[PDB]
Symmetry: none
Subunit: 296 residues, 4 copies
């Protein structure tokens, strides 16, 4: 041999006065370095070195050439330093968004495992849902998002990799009059806390009512906050839909009961979403692997 | 001169990103929508939209115009709703954001009380924090935010009415190495999950370490989601700060312990924030009253 | 109607105490304004005005409504002011690039005519050639470019409108030994000043040599500057190619002679190039019209 | 460790914007090129290229790396060329930029003289001005620039050797209203074509108006092209400043007149500018000598 190795060796030769000593010091093959310098001299059509009783010195040509060699060796080191600095900041940070089912079950175990493997990466995690996360995924402010989406609706700009097949549960307060219901039609007159979903607030229950041949569900309120949702429901007669993970993991469990209908609800697929054109850091790859491991 | 229907059409266009998609929603012919938009553009003598691969996007002029469009449309709607309320037709919409201490304690009781008194008003609740909420207060899309803030910081066109003085605790997993610590200095070498705050992630612990003469706290990760935070802490050795309300009301209580520090921590004030010059609707004032009632 | 006219009228009514006087002052039809206010009151389901012996006053409902009306009227004026400010800066400036044949013959007459019609537009003109101008056209720093290009080679991002069919002439010093040549083959051993062209320096003469079955032309030097080219040639034995306009309009005319070969050279088409997705100001449109007028 | 051939390949890729297009130029298999690039990326542990619709583009890492790549490649080439020249093989390349006074007077004579002495060196001349030329001096793609500059301003890593002290005149059309003016104050209300200068367009006339106690000169237009400038002035009532050399040597002399002012105008110094730590090739030094000879 590599020209940069030969140039670094030439610099060392000027300093120590010996091709052989410079080879030894740099851990290069002496005959290899000798052949490499010969090849360079042939290409340049002039000798760089002249033999002395001492060892070797630079020729007039070698002194001229060395000014360039030093610039080139320094520039290569500067390039490597700059790339190291830029890469270090890139590899050193992850920012992503996560939906409640991921945030509550997969993430905590995944973050702990991840941090053992990648002790020097700063992770920035926020709540996020599709398509809200889309402009942030696209402008590059969010590296990836872990969110429910409908395969056919996802922006062409985005890659989508399935992560978890989630459950939706209908939930009300522990003593709700409809707690024993078997069919969705039995709930058709209840009032709903419309919760967040890819197609808009309440889209899941609205679409379920529609497919089961029912009128629009009655809007009680819109609660886009999953943090607030279990408590709002616990202290009202509203029904809602939520991921089963949230039903299992909230501060109001003693005050809530799911209503296990014999009518099936959808199982939203949670995806890893990101721009397809955009390179992924090793750490981001590693975190997604850990999240995948804990999402089964 | 601007036409109100066209403003609403432009907002819809922005929401969905296509002329064809918007036209469907507004029950209008594709060209009919274009006629109206072109009318607004022809007169402003400025293009508001640009054809993209994915549909239409706002030009620079369009982006600037939107904040005005939204305030005009939302104020026109609030004007109508208020008049109805003044005649005892208690219908309308209220959209507001809340912080974790409010959402978990005051809000479930307040919304239940409000709904009993004003059954026909449609309420939309979301998460939110100052200053992120400021642009939505200014354009009228958010009627108020219940959020921590520092009195002196708040922008001059906003009004801030005190709602609740919160309590901050430091929390770790139940068997944390420092579970029995009583001084902030003993935590100097611990790693932190930086939680959200008006002054930015980790601001409370950074400012507490500062005032107690300590170096910067060691960043473990940034967790902007209060929904995710307790579980993240429960399954790691990260410490965090959280509102006492969250410490008492989360899904991981049995796995968490507050550190029994005898160094005092701050007590952030939660405010009702609004754009001052906008007249509060009677319905919104009623909801704010119920929230205040339950926040004491 | 228009709601904003009705709102402005309502503001005036509060001030002057008369619907009829407010209509007269604003140059609105009295019966039209009366009907418009009635329609608004019907929509709001409350009266805004009550008759007095004096004229009219606002009702309690009208006083509440007026707070919103004033915000809406102010906001519309602010929107119009902001758009005016943004549009004014957009319409007030043009920046473009031009090739030598345009710069020397069409532009000076076109700029003078343009400036009479658009006295308040600042024009910024620079030299430019395709494809060098492409990244600047695409990022929006250059509004348009007037340059030679090959139709099939132009970026899909760009619109191209033909402006002028130019002539290429071979030029040497007045006494060049080959001044009387009739065939390109007679020049095959001459040395060339490679001049700028869309396909790279010397592309025209290299491609002409190739099509006429000749070897590569001999490179004397590369002169990318058309400003420098006529003088460099006047003081050497180099031949070059240049637009006929440059041959006719340079400081070294007395020292140069074109060599009128019977072998034809190409006639590069000069285009107006720009991003197709990007809206064009009236002034830019007007300038291009003036340039077109003077490019025939 | 970096490989020189791969750096050259990356520069070629950047020039043409496609892997396929670059591979053709370098006489290599598509995949072979990718192998080499992937080798450089795999080792840097950073992506240098991204697939776009139009081919490939440099990543942030790639853009940062390019300045280093270019200096390394161009220094390696200069090293070889210098060695050849030191053996009396006067071949190589010199690339340089020149300002209008130099290009029109000194340059035609200097290039002719240089070509007689060093017939086998390939010279590439372009227009250029400080500070626009600085990045190309730093990355080694431009060997020197002959340009006006202010001594004190010049960046510390650049060397500036004085070449010529120029003369500025104010010029208008022959029958200009102010053709017979003798004081700068008499021109206060005239409109100006702002011509290019190291401190920005119009800097000379702005700074002259300033020093003479006058208000800002009235901007008529900005004309960055000295090629276009004389014709633009000849066919309008715009005044401009230009080097006296340009006033004497342009295509519109019969239609132009210098204003016979008895207020003194500045005399900008033209310098030879280079990156100081780069060793000047013997051939470049020879060309600089001839330019100095003719600039006196
Ligand atoms: Cl959905
Ligand atoms: Cl804070
Ligand atoms: Cl070409
Ligand atoms: Cl200057």
């Amino acid at each position: 041999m590599l020209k940069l190795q030969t140039l670094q060796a030439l610099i060392c030769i000027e300093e120590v006065g010996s091709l052989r000593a410079a080879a030894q010091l740099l851990h290069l093959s002496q005959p290899a370095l000798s052949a490499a310098i010969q090849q360079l001299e042939d290409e340049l059509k002039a000798p760089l070195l002249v033999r002395t009783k001492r060892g070797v010195s630079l020729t007039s040509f070698g002194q001229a050439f060395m000014k360039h060699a030093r610039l080139i060796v320094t520039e290569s080191r500067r390039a490597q330093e700059e790339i190291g600095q830029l890469r270090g900041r890139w590899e050193g940070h992850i920012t992503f968004a996560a939906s409640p089912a991921i945030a509550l079950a997969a993430l905590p175990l995944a973050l702990a495992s991840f941090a053992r493997e990648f002790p020097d990466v700063t992770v920035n995690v926020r709540d996020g849902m599709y398509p809200a996360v889309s402009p942030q995924l696209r402008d590059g402010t969010l590296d990836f998002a872990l969110t429910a989406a409908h395969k056919h609706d996802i922006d062409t700009d985005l890659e989508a990799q399935p992560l978890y097949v989630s459950d939706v549960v209908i939930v009300g307060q522990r003593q709700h009059p409809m707690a024993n219901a078997t069919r969705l039609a039995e709930l058709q007159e209840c009032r709903w806390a419309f919760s967040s979903a890819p197609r808009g607030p309440g889209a899941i229950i609205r679409n379920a009512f529609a497919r089961y041949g029912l009128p629009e569900p009655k809007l009680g309120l819109v609660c886009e906050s999953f943090l607030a949702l279990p408590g709002v429901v616990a202290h009202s007669d509203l029904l809602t839909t939520m991921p089963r993970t949230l039903y299992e993991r909230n501060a109001f469990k003693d005050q809530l009961c799911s209503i296990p209908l014999q009518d099936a609800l959808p199982n939203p697929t949670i995806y890893v979403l990101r721009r397809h054109d955009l390179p992924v850091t090793p750490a981001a790859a590693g975190l997604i692997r850990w999240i995948q491991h804990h999402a089964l």
